[PDB]
Symmetry: C3
Subunit: 137 residues, 3 copies
Amino acid sequence: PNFSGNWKIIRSENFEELLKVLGVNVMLRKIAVAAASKPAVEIKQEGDTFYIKTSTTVRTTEINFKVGEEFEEQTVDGRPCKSLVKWESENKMVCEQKLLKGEGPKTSWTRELTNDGELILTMTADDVVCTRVYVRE
Amino acid sequence: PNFSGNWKIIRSENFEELLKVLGVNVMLRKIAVAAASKPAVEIKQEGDTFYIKTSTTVRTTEINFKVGEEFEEQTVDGRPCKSLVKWESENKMVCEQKLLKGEGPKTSWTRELTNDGELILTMTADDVVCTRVYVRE
Amino acid sequence: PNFSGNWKIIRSENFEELLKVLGVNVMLRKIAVAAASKPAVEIKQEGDTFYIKTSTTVRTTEINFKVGEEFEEQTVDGRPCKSLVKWESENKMVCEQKLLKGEGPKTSWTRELTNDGELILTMTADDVVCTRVYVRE
Ligand SMILES: C=C1C2=C(C[C@@]1(C)C/C=C/C(C)=C/C(=O)O)C(C)(C)CCC2
Ligand SMILES: C=C1C2=C(C[C@@]1(C)C/C=C/C(C)=C/C(=O)O)C(C)(C)CCC2
Ligand SMILES: C=C1C2=C(C[C@@]1(C)C/C=C/C(C)=C/C(=O)O)C(C)(C)CCC2
């Protein structure tokens, strides 16, 4: 496997629908959709240790985590949560998220490495799944 | 008293009117209004020493200050200023702001802790006062 | 010469046209145009060593470089590039940019100090030149 690399997006579906579900307002959703159009994803994997940077021209996020070990990050909409990543399999990690404070839709995300040079990111907010596909830059 | 805690907003009035006064353009005002809708305020008080973080999905500000002692921050619209906070009373601090460079409307802000679990933030730009009320998250 | 100082803008032309050329989408272009309206440029020069901070209420960039020595920054649109600055003359430095990864329009920027208290910034994206003029704040 090895997720390491710079990734660029090629396909995306249900991203706005996912934001609507998380109650992001129309103005913020418009900015998010425009910015998520050309992100730059940098991933660094050394064993079960990952570093994932996701840059856009308006908002950038960086996560550091070790698989199977709980850590703190934020939901797509900017809410702080407790996250635990695990290997569903050799090439697919799954992440369950739990909100530190407040109520909200149930969220998670998965990252998978295909055998043909793609990285698939799925993000779920209750019953809405956004799928984004990337290739090495 | 003790301002410490995570606060969420419940009421707000005259925020856009305040921005208009500070000459913020319509596009920026629209983004500001959309982002200020659900901020996350983190406050840490240890004596007369405060740390106030105000996060939104687009722009986040952090201030560190000791009451009665001049420090450097920015106006709501992003202009650098010299600020001095003082206790108007036991539960209310007042902040006078003076622009480092340039001319502009006279600005200030006050934070007050009520006896019923609310934090009140007022922000003034000349004769416009924006009032925002928060409760513990 | 000596570029050091805080600069405010007085004139600007072709900024949106330049962004269109770089393929920035309409939403991002609208936000960029609104934010670039009142930036705050801080420049620090100690010999051939420069530090240029450009703040706006939405996005801020900082570059550190030594003239004639290659360094890493980003294009106006947020793309990482290898940059080498050189003195075209006593009061004018020129910067050629080369994209780390991917294809794109040919970009560069120049900064010039006039004899009447202005700083001129030109930015080029292929055959579009944006000119921005500043004065000391
Ligand atoms: C500019 C963005 C904004 C948001 C999310 C983001 C970051 C766009 C998302 C990009 C992704 C998810 C890229 C990727 O992973 O390919 C919010 C919803 C908080 C709203 C504020 C602006
Ligand atoms: C996104 C924001 C923007 C601005 C202010 C802010 C930060 C919204 C303010 C939130 C507040 C005041 C929250 C609170 O204190 O509850 C500016 C005017 C610079 C314009 C650019 C975007
Ligand atoms: C808010 C800005 C945005 C952009 C550029 C910038 C930074 C506006 C530029 C200001 C300049 C060039 C100021 C100056 O130098 O006077 C992008 C195109 C990435 C799009 C996202 C928002």
